[PDB]
């Protein structure tokens, strides 16, 4: 792996230290860990996110390294994205997983992440908590009590993020 | 029997920018956040739970590198430490 490995004593110290307040890890022999990357680089109106490939190669290899099988889906639409998510909610493998990772990479605006057909005038927005809603205990009972880590690279508007101060 | 479960719990979301603001991407190198996130995961996945690794990525953004962003962690409902356990 290219991730720095926990020697067995290290892990042991961590379970022996906090055992009641830690997510349980399923056995390496048998767990079926899934992760999902959705990445939009080619868009219909707005300019192509050159550089995204590196991000996909980076994250695919990491999650995999961390123990996950990785679906990568690219250049989708809020709706395609939704449908993928609902399918992801339904994968049997979750039953034998102990966590999941979803990664979204796209342009985004303040309402949420952009699907490929986004224009200024017709929005293709995936709402920040459509994503939550789709993996909650109702919609994804399989991941009840398991960590769901959602990671999002997207802009959140146009502002540069800084204010000036002096001295 | 049927028991009640919380409808949401055990979630965490990690965004590249704070609301209203841009985040930075480079042609030949990809996006600053994703790269930094990988670096930190590689180094810290062993010894730190996922929430402290995320914090350390925010701290890597504390001096505005010219281009500024500050990743934000959101909707946390993680009730327990999540240690990834690399090599296990």
């Amino acid at each position: 792996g290219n991730v720095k490995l926990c020697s067995l004593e290290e892990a042991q110290r961590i379970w022996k230290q906090k055992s009641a307040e830690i997510y349980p890890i399923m056995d390496k022999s048998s767990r079926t860990r899934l992760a999902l990357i959705i990445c939009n680089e080619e868009f219909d109106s707005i300019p192509r996110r050159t550089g995204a490939e590196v991000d996909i190669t980076g994250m695919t290899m990491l999650l995999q390294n961390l123990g996950y099988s990785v679906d990568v889906k690219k250049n989708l639409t809020a709706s395609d994205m939704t449908t993928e998510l609902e399918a992801f909610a339904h994968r049997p493998e979750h039953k034998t997983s102990d966590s999941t990772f979803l990664v979204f990479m796209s342009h985004g605006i303040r309402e949420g992440i952009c699907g490929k057909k986004h224009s200024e005038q017709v929005p293709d927005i995936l709402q920040l908590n459509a994503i939550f809603n789709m993996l909650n205990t109702k919609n994804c009972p399989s991941l009840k009590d398991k960590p769901k880590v959602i990671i999002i690279q997207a802009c959140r508007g146009d502002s540069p993020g800084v204010v000036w101060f002096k001295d | 029997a049927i028991k009640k479960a919380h409808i949401e719990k055990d979630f965490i979301a990690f965004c590249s920018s704070t609301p209203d603001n841009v985040s930075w991407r480079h042609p030949t190198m990809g996006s600053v956040f994703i790269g930094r996130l990988i670096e930190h995961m590689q180094e810290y996945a062993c010894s730190c739970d996922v929430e402290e690794i995320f914090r350390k990525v925010r701290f890597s953004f504390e001096q505005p590198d010219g281009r500024a962003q500050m990743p934000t962690t959101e909707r946390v409902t993680l009730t327990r430490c999540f240690y990834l356990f690399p090599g296990h």
Binding site: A154, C155 | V22, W24, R25, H26, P27
Partner: peptide
Amino acid sequence: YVAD
């Protein structure tokens, strides 16, 4: 650098 481009914003995203």
